[PDB]
Amino acid sequence: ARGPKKHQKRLSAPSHWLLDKLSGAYAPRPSTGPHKLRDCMPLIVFVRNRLKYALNYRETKAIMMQRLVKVDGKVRTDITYPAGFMDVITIEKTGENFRLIYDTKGRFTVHRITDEEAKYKLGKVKRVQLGRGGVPFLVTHDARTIRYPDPLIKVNDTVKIDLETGKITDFIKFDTGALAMITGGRNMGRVGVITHRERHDGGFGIVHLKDALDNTFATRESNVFVIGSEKPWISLPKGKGVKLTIAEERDQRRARALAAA
Amino acid sequence: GISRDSRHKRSHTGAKRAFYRKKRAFELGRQPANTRIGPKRIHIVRTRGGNHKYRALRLDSGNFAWGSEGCTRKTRIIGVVYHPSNNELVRTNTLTKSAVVQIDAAPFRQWYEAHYGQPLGRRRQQKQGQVVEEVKKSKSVEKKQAARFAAHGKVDPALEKQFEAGRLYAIISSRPGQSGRADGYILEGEELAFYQRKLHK
Amino acid sequence: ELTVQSERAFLKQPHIFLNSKVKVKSTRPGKGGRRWYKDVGLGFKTPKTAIEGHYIDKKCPFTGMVSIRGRILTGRVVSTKMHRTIIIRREYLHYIPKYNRYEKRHKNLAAHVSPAFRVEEGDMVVVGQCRPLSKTVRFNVLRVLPRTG
RNA sequence: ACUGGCUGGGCUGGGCCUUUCCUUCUGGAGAACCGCAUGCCGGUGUGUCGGGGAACCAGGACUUUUACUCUGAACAAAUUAGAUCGCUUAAAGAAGGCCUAUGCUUGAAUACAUUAGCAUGGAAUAAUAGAAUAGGACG
RNA sequence: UACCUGGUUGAUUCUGCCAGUAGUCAUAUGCUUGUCUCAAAGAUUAAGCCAUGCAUGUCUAAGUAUAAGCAAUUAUACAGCGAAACUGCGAAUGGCUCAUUAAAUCAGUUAUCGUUUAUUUGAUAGUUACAUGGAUAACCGUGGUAAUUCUAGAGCUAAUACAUGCUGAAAAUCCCGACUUCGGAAGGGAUGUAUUUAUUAGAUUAAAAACCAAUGCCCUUCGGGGCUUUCUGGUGAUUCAUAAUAACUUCUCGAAUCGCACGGCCUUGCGCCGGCGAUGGUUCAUUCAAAUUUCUGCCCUAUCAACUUUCGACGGCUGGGUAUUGGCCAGCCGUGGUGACAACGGGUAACGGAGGGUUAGGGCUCGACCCCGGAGAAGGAGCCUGAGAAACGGCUACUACA
DSSP states (O other): OOSOOOOOBTTSSOGGGOOOSSSOSBOOOOOOSSSOSSSOEEHHHIIIIISOOOSSHHHHHHHHHTTOOEETTBOOOOSSOEEOTTOEEEETTTTEEEEOOBOTTSSBOOOBOOTTTTSOEEEEEEEEEEOGGGOEEEEETTSOEEESOOTTOOTTOEEEEOSSSOOEEEEEOOSTTOEEEEOSSSSTTOEEEEEEEEOOTTSOOEEEEEOTTSOEEEEEGGGEEEEESSSOSSOOOTTOSOOOOHHHHHHHHHHHHHHHO | OOBOOSTTSBOTTSOBOOOOOOOOSSSBOOOOOOOEESSOEEEEEEETTTEEEEEEEEESEEEEEETTTTEEEEEEBOOOOBOSSOTHHHHHTOOOTTOEEEEOOHHHHHHHHHHOOOOOSOOOTTTOTTOOOOOOSOSHHHHHHHHHHHHHOOOOHHHHHHHHHTOEEEEEOSOHHHHSOOOEEEOOTTHHHHHHHHHHO | OOOSOOSSSOOOOTTOOOOOSSOOOOSSHHHHTSOOOOOOBTTBOOOHHHHSOOOOOTTSSSSSSOOOOSOEEEEEEEEOOSSSEEEEEEEEEEOOGGGTSOEEEEEEEEEEOOSSOOOOTTOEEEEEEOSOOSSSOOEEEOOOOOOOO
8 A cells, every 4th residue: 555554443353452432533553663563562551551650741751761660671762562472671770660461351451570581581492503603592572682592492382581681581392381471362361281293294282281270171272371390480460360251250249349348 | 667567457358457456566577687798887786585587788609519519618799690580680680599609619619629639610621821730649549539439439511611711600599698607508400491591591 | 198398498496406426225215316396284295196207387386486374175077177276166065144044155166186196076175275386376286185986 | 048868750962782883003101900018097199110001192094086064263433232320301412430538449341244265063955976898906 | 013904896805006104323304492411413416616824744862063142250172051954763544435346345154385574572793993074054244036944156064964984812624735754744725694596414224144355443362353433403394493515796794972970999100990771683483464375155137158279278388577376477389268056248326334213933125334444535546755656635747627
């Protein structure tokens, strides 16, 4: 259409941003960065629509511009910045640290973490090979490319990154018995244990997982994100991704409310 | 300008198509540049995405290579003698890929003489006008060739007798019109049979 | 085929040097100096007539530079009067929901047939998707099914 | 509302026997049954003790082909059905709620589309091939 | 809410239609009109024609300041704010409409081992030098035409504009070789990356020997017994990733660039070293993408039954051209391709879809129109700049208006 598009019309934005169908005609239109446009978390909606710090468009730009908030340790001031899975956003002058992570309904939450655990990340590897001059390197899901990694590491595995120098600190395999978290689909936010894997030579293999309550579900390999073998390496949010059904959820909620009051 | 789409064509059942859209920026084509023999002249065109291409119009020398001995020297090209597609090209000496041409052996033979002190294709013994030689400034060097000859061997007889005339057969394998450098290699072996009969019969 | 070399140019696999003085016997068909070939995969076996042959056909999925990826279909050989191409017939059943019963339909397709295989009228075929070769050819014959009485 | 019992009556499913049991190779770890003794009240952690056949995983080979049905994966937002909150009610909206608070806490669910394409279980129903001038199967 | 009533006859029972009854985010019109919440609106005929006003520009401490520019008095190169102008970027997004279009657009689902990509993000490049050269804007001053966002000739000057252009060190590899104790060697050249061509490596499944030619050897009683040895990634699949050799090029890139801080050493020299940023730069990866592409699916018509190839119609080969594949194009050669399971052609008061209206179930009908995709700016064609245009609030020519 005679070039690339540069506006994004409201009522077409991703549903998990939780924007109202009234009060304006346009949406923030995230810029281009390390995470997909369809799967990202604009900073402007985070500060104004989630933390309620700013009331209006104008005050939102003042916060990022004054270099008061830094994603992953690097203070980036662009408003429509794409923030994605597993990334760490830290605001130091007020002492809060958040991690973008899914809940059991497939959306983003305001998760609080401690200052000791805000200094490392982990990410899936998509390609590992040797670049020019024979050096070997790999790139993760947020466009970090590290070279000279441990040779044993293979594709689809997960690696831990330090966030101040940026070297692998530990690794995880991808086989039966691991602990994973799904990142896309109907099963967004579930947490399970790899039961076994089924391979289809030619595309789109399937994997079977088992929950803690003995539930069963399945997903594609390119949609699972291993975060541990046992004893998850990060602080899961409230609910721990167990996917209660509707019937119990209403029952327990009323009981807790009456007991509190 | 010229267009390279498929809309103006006729479907595989015979149905005439209808008009869809005006011509597009992409899918275009350019006037075929012609390359011949002459003084070096080159034109540069600016392609899509800030890239450039080269256009050959006239050439006289290009990189050639002898695979068996691994010698690559930019020799001068005489004339195209055979083109598989159509005879019209040969008469006007316009050179394209897979065109049999004539190449001299001035650098290649000179390199062979350094490689070994052995005569190559000499049937001028009757005249012996130009016979001359110079003493190698050692005897260890003859030892080197006396042992190099043991494994490398000798050039086959059919190819040798070609040096007597002083004209070699070559094939162009580059694309004059895209890259600008008419590169080529030198033929050998059973390939001679097929082309030899065709060229001069 | 009667003669291998019958055109204006000389037919040969690219980047396969033949006229080397020293002779060495080894593995890796391409490296040694003999005919080169690969394996497509998916449990498909390269037939012996492809390896112990002399034909040159830069389109054939074996001994050539074309990859197979995409759909895999089956059909019928309706005609083989063309040169190294065939036409395949595929039948299926449409639905027509309102009347709660099906129709018969019909479609023809054109797939490149390699010289390795031999396929007379009335035989099965399996094809796989490749790069655009001709105006209407995008598939290649892979397995002629055994011929039943 | 909670607890146990009937050799209670049924429905769904899984194992063996009746000529029918259910393919096969390589590797991983390892339970039950077995013999040893340091220990306690016919038994067990003992140990880098060892011998069987089998549940799981990874790897390789083999199987008449389509139609049909079950279960999975993937597939916009708005719209349809539909849960919650007294905008003073309603059409609407996705808000809100608690005490006194320099504060705390929640929701923004769920189902369907249905044809075509990708996997999985079922083997009745409707088609199709197989040994007859044996050019048949096995060692 | 799965529903019916009046009408042919002197009166009766039927087939059968006409009329009545209800809804419509479905248009027009007549009569009438006190209040509160919400707000559609030149689509249908004419994608007919347009006066006038507007709808796209942009500066931070960080590209270029001698304003006879403003403001003070810390700057004898300047140092604050700052008109005009050069340079950089966008102007290819938005907004409007539905004329053309019947496997065409479009929908779900696949592929790029067949390509391009400014910008964003992450990595990444040892083979005069206290600094190189000419113009031009703004500007003073002299002009032309009734007419314009027209411009002439004379005199000055800046670059992140244009054009040049050294950069510290050694090892190792292949060739030439000053030199003979027939045994290795003085010294001599090349070796980043960009392009093109040719050759080489890029392995591997279970083992025991026995012969031909000969040279590193350990132990050793000099009779001899022997023999061990290093790497090699990935996909279902490649000539993949990567490396080595021989060469080549009107031939690139490897910072003559700008702001803040004011530091440390000893030969005390207008000496050496040192931080954080901005703007750029070859290649790889990512993001926004784009272009092609596999399978299946569209309303009426037989008073449309055989169509396509003269001047490509189906395929093979060799090249050309494009960012790349391809009958896309140029040559030579075969005779093919679709069809009663409805091809080809004709009509549409036809943009497609998500969807709207009405209901027992099954359906009938509408969809220019707030979301996604496509096309167009009076009708046709052609092109410059750029990563991206066959652009029209860009240019060139014809037609019709003016």
